[PDB]
């Protein structure tokens, strides 16, 4: 069973998502993360291609868990009487982006460009797999410090991607768009672009731009740090009040600020090693 298959290490974190432990797969010593989610806390349920009743998180992870290393991979899952247990791949050494920014402050634009580009590629992979993350933020991004590779985590607030309106949301409010705050309605892709604007501002300024609902609704972007005109333009574009005024992923990646990105290994060599 699960208990014999894995060696439990220390608690890595706990919160809205559940409890996550560091671990080692006993068969090949592979580093893993063991996530426990209480059944009473799971509101969104779904079913696998076979038809087993599992949390939506398990459905979304299976849809995205393949060769591409931009999303944390689900290795296995187990059902207990009062919880679900998820075995996830664990990079080592690792640091989440929230802890990274907290320790190092506002990122150099070359570093933010590499990081932002990788997040964009990871989000495009999710969308191509029919998955909408809904909680893109610094806390949900892991940095593989040796490879300079970023990984999206926590699909616990996610949904299947659709072209119709979403009227439910349980992600982070300070990353949520003005249409959600005002009307309790949003479309997947344009809401994801708004959260990406919040994230990019956070990378280059060291903090999020808005705290209160009134600020999100006004959408006036003030720069507290020295930021290039091209970067400011891209941020202000992602943070357009009207969802239809926001750039597509293609327009973000073709933006002049996004040109000449470093490879992840070059990123680790210059900024992480
Ligand atoms: N948010 C607390 C840490 O959560 C995680 C989740 C997944 C992995 Cl692979 C790791 Cl290393 C840590």
Swiss-Prot record:
Q: Tell me which Pfam families the record gives.
A: Pkinase
Residues found modified as Phosphoserine: 66, 229
Record's keyword terms, sorted: Apoptosis, ATP-binding, Cell cycle, Cell membrane, Cytoplasm, Host-virus interaction, Kinase, Magnesium, Membrane, Metal-binding, Nucleotide-binding, Nucleus, Phosphoprotein, Proto-oncogene, Serine/threonine-protein kinase, Transferase, Ubl conjugation
Q: Which InterPro entries does the record associate with it?
A: Kinase-like_dom_sf, PIM1/2/3, PIM_Ser/Thr_kinase, Prot_kinase_dom, Protein_kinase_ATP_BS, Ser/Thr_kinase_AS
Source domain of life: Eukaryota
Locate the active site: 135 (proton acceptor)
What cofactor(s) does the depicted protein rely on? Answer: Mg(2+)
Molecular function in Gene Ontology: ATP binding; manganese ion binding; protein serine kinase activity; protein serine/threonine kinase activator activity; protein serine/threonine kinase activity; ribosomal small subunit binding; transcription factor binding
Q: In which tissues is it expressed?
A: Expressed primarily in cells of the hematopoietic and germline lineages. Isoform 1 and isoform 2 are both expressed in prostate cancer cell lines.
Q: Which GO terms describe its cellular component?
A: cytoplasm; cytosol; nucleolus; nucleoplasm; nucleus; plasma membrane
Outcome (variant: residue 50 to K): Decreased kinase activity
Q: Which residues bind ATP?
A: 12-20, 35, 89, 96
Q: Which family does it belong to?
A: Belongs to the protein kinase superfamily. CAMK Ser/Thr protein kinase family. PIM subfamily.
Q: How does it assemble?
A: Interacts with RP9. Interacts with HSP90AA1, this interaction stabilizes PIM1 protein levels. Interacts (ubiquitinated form) with HSP70 and promotes its proteasomal degradation. (Microbial infection) Interacts with Epstein-Barr virus EBNA6; this interaction upregulates and stabilizes PIM1 and induces cell proliferation by inhibiting the growth suppressive properties of p21.
Descriptive protein name: Serine/threonine-protein kinase pim-1
Question: Which organism's genome codes for this protein?
Answer: Homo sapiens (Human)
Q: Which gene encodes it?
A: PIM1
């Amino acid at each position: 069973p699960l208990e014999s298959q894995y060696q439990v290490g220390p608690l890595l974190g706990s919160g809205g998502f559940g409890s996550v432990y560091s671990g080692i797969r006993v068969s090949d010593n592979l580093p893993v993360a063991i996530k426990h989610v209480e059944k009473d806390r799971i509101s969104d349920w779904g079913e696998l291609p076979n038809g087993t009743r599992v949390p939506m998180e398990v459905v979304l992870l299976k849809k995205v868990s393949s060769g591409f290393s931009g999303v944390i991979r689900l290795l296995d899952w187990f059902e207990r009487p009062d919880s679900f247990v998820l075995i996830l791949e664990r990079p080592e050494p690792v640091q989440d982006l929230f802890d990274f920014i907290t320790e190092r402050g506002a990122l150099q634009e070359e570093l933010a460009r590499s990081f932002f580009w990788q997040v964009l590629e990871a989000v495009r992979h999710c969308h191509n797999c029919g998955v909408l993350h809904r909680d893109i933020k610094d806390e949900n991004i892991l940095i593989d410090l040796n490879r300079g590779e970023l990984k999206l985590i926590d699909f616990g607030s996610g949904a299947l991607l659709k072209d119709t309106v979403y009227t439910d949301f349980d992600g982070t409010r300070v990353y949520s768009p003005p249409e959600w705050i005002r009307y309790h309605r949003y479309h997947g892709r344009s809401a994801a672009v708004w959260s990406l604007g919040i994230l990019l501002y956070d990378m280059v300024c060291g903090d999020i731009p808005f705290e209160h609902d009134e600020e999100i609704i006004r959408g006036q972007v003030f720069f507290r740090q020295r930021v290039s005109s091209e970067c400011q333009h891209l941020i202000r574009w992602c943070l357009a009040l009207r969802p239809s005024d926001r750039p597509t992923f293609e327009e973000i990646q073709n933006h002049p600020w996004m040109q000449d990105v470093l490879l992840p290994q070059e990123t680790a060599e210059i900024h992480l090693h």
